[PDB]
Design an enzyme around this catalytic site. Structure first.
Site, PDB file in Angstrom:
ATOM      1  CG  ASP A  84      -1.960  -3.067   7.444  1.00  0.00           C
ATOM      2  OD1 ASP A  84      -2.694  -3.086   6.424  1.00  0.00           O
ATOM      3  OD2 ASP A  84      -0.757  -3.439   7.325  1.00  0.00           O
ATOM      4  CD  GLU A 136       0.071  -1.203   3.176  1.00  0.00           C
ATOM      5  OE1 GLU A 136       0.626  -1.141   4.348  1.00  0.00           O
ATOM      6  OE2 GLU A 136      -0.082  -2.241   2.523  1.00  0.00           O
ATOM      7  CD  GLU A 159      -3.995  -6.240  10.981  1.00  0.00           C
ATOM      8  OE1 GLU A 159      -4.378  -5.212  10.362  1.00  0.00           O
ATOM      9  OE2 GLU A 159      -2.843  -6.728  10.879  1.00  0.00           O
ATOM     10  CG  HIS A 184      -2.651  -7.941   6.058  1.00  0.00           C
ATOM     11  ND1 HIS A 184      -1.763  -7.256   5.268  1.00  0.00           N
ATOM     12  CD2 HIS A 184      -2.643  -7.318   7.260  1.00  0.00           C
ATOM     13  CE1 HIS A 184      -1.257  -6.235   5.952  1.00  0.00           C
ATOM     14  NE2 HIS A 184      -1.770  -6.257   7.168  1.00  0.00           N
TER      15      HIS A 184
HETATM   16  C1  CAX Z   1       3.154  -7.087   8.647  1.00  0.00           C
HETATM   17  C2  CAX Z   1       2.196  -6.401   9.594  1.00  0.00           C
HETATM   18  C3  CAX Z   1       2.659  -4.963   9.960  1.00  0.00           C
HETATM   19  O1  CAX Z   1       3.891  -4.520   9.484  1.00  0.00           O
HETATM   20  C4  CAX Z   1       2.475  -4.803  11.475  1.00  0.00           C
HETATM   21  C5  CAX Z   1       1.415  -5.859  11.800  1.00  0.00           C
HETATM   22  C6  CAX Z   1       0.072  -5.170  11.610  1.00  0.00           C
HETATM   23  C7  CAX Z   1      -0.304  -4.715  10.222  1.00  0.00           C
HETATM   24  O2  CAX Z   1      -1.224  -5.344   9.641  1.00  0.00           O
HETATM   25  O3  CAX Z   1       0.314  -3.728   9.717  1.00  0.00           O
HETATM   26  C8  CAX Z   1       1.745  -7.072  10.914  1.00  0.00           C
HETATM   27  C9  CAX Z   1       0.548  -8.016  10.763  1.00  0.00           C
HETATM   28  C10 CAX Z   1       2.883  -7.824  11.619  1.00  0.00           C
END
Ligand code: CAX
Ligand code: CAX
Ligand code: CAX
Ligand code: CA
Lengths: 249, 248, 248
Positions: free
Chosen positions: C151, C121, C241, C142
């Protein structure tokens, strides 16, 4: 206190409901043939989406039709369109139809088995949209019949197709074939008729295996913008549509 | 109380106005040649869109140009861009131009007869957008001239093309040809020059035959999102654009 | 009061910062190889975007990676995902990451040098998006890992790809190749690996020559809709999340 599946699965004459491994298959039909759009089908869908939303044993939803069409016939005589109080029943259940759909907090997969010219906004609101090669999409019963597309069509089509494609689609009677709908981004995959439902099941099973809250909240976080615009604009549309329609008689 | 068509049809030197069976054809022009964008044309369109919106005998609107271009020339000297008080007259009419357009409550069809590099946002705000094969779209007089695209360009292009196409279009001087505009979803049909107006008329006639309130309310229910974002962001853009311009 | 470039340019272990003629090149990396996504890299980017936003000598920003990938490897063990208080640190910095990015008031160009499966993103939030032929985009960490795309992924992908493409992309593990991203409108140009950075610099230099306020306000008037939806939806997604992840 929620109606479990064993109580609502047989409640709707135009909606077959079958569930396996938490995957709910919703098949719209008129006596086992392709759905004919009526007041009954419209109201059944509103009540049925409520039951589905409130039943936590639904892990994923597949929406589909049967036979050669998803829904490409309408019985306008099944509706009462002449007076404000008749229209209020339509407005109230028309709000419930789309809002109950959006209140479903699991992923929804559409499997569009052929032409849909009535309520095509319902399958295209899904998180994943699969179309048979024979599928088509048209806003049939609104502007081509001299009726305002005010029932959520006006929200969904500009939202999914974009501003100009959406407005043009609604004003000119445009019919999208499967590959055009794919190109416009309304459809995600175009499949042969025989591949369609197997693909819907494949995707649904994979999603159903994901962790309970991850699956439910994925749906929830992804429906934010559609819910915002629907709350802003739906009722406005319906009331204007009703006014214009009453002017006809 | 509304100005009738017989009075306003003859008021605007850069806008020809002809109406048949409630179909209003709006043709922008400079002395019968393709429109040259000026302060007068800008302000006339704002006043004219008000007159059109207030006149219920307009059933449907077709917006088009004349000659080889829709509008691909500008006279920057016709505008006063040096001070805040001069800019407030532009901000005020610039708001009127796009808000009056959106206040029209019948369907609007654009027939883009050729290149449009000035105010291309106006045709592309239409409900139905038809383009000749020779049509092109470019945000000419903003970022290429070192001017912020803050006059509604910033609203319309990201709205219609999408976030990344819209921003790229405005920042890199991009010119969309007719088939790229079609692919991007800004244009609905690309036609030969000779078929363009015949097709606009065919669509307009068909719409004009729809029931009175259905036709009017179709337009109303379909412009909600554009009206929301225009109200949120237009004046903000115009004020920032004026500030940056005055800094020149 | 603001940290000048000479004080933050060497602050970040995963972000190389080089500036020439006001064009700031931001190169993400892990010891000079392609970035491996970690808690450190995530928080560094949040702080770094703040420094960049507050430093008026940045005229234009290019974001890029190094080596074969932009970022296609992740170290999940670098993150603490087990408890609410641990998730609040991620939520707080996750908000800052995307909000600080959006607070940058100069044009942002992405040069996506290869596969990105973590934080894709970020590049696609840019005003201009350039991709190498080998670039790919996927929401890696995700839903494929049983984690909600809450996020900002949930904001950005439906915003840039459209409602149905965005949701499908996030729910099915879809990987977009460079030319599909281009077709979907998330990418503006696809280039050879050798041409990519030269093209980023060419565009950046051209933009950097535009007048000061016109350049700054062009960015500001173009990020309105993204800022609006991010503020509406980002924190809602992060909290959901976190809840789902803790339930694991
Ligand atoms: C890769 C991801 C982010 O960098 C932080 C955490 C939350 C997110 O979704 O941004 C995660 C799931 C470990
Ligand atoms: C076909 C349509 C609906 O099902 C109910 C009415 C309102 C609506 O949804 O537009 C209708 C026009 C008869
Ligand atoms: C061409 C332009 C407009 O017509 C008015 C001014 C402000 C605007 O609309 O951007 C302009 C820059 C001279
Ligand atoms: Ca497209």
């Amino acid at each position: 206190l929620a109606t479990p599946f064993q109580e609502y699965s047989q409640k709707y004459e135009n909606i077959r409901l079958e569930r396996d491994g938490g995957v709910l298959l919703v098949t719209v039909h008129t006596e086992g043939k392709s759905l004919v759009w009526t007041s009954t089908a419209h109201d059944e869908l509103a009540y049925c989406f409520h039951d589905i939303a409130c039943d936590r044993e639904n892990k994923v939803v597949i929406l589909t039709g049967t036979g050669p069409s998803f829904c490409n016939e309408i019985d306008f005589t099944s509706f009462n369109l002449g007076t404000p109080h008749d229209w209020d029943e339509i407005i109230f259940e028309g709000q419930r139809l789309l809002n109950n759909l959006l209140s479903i907090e699991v992923p929804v997969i559409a499997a569009v088995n052929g032409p849909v010219t009535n309520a095509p906004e319902i399958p295209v609101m899904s998180d994943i949209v699969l179309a048979a090669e024979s599928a088509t999409f048209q806003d049939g019963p609104h502007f081509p019949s001299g009726i305002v597309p005010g029932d959520g069509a006006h929200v969904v089509w500009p939202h999914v197709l974009g501003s100009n494609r959406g407005r043009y689609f609604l004003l000119t009677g445009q019919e999208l074939d499967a590959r055009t709908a794919l190109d416009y981004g309304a459809v995600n995959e175009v499949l042969s008729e025989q591949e369609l439902l197997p693909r819907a099941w494949e995707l649904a099973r994979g999603i159903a295996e994901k962790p309970l809250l991850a699956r439910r909240y994925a749906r929830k976080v992804l429906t934010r913008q559609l819910r915002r615009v629907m709350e802003a604009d739906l009722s406005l549309g319906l009331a204007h549509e009703a006014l214009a329609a009453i002017d006809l008689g």
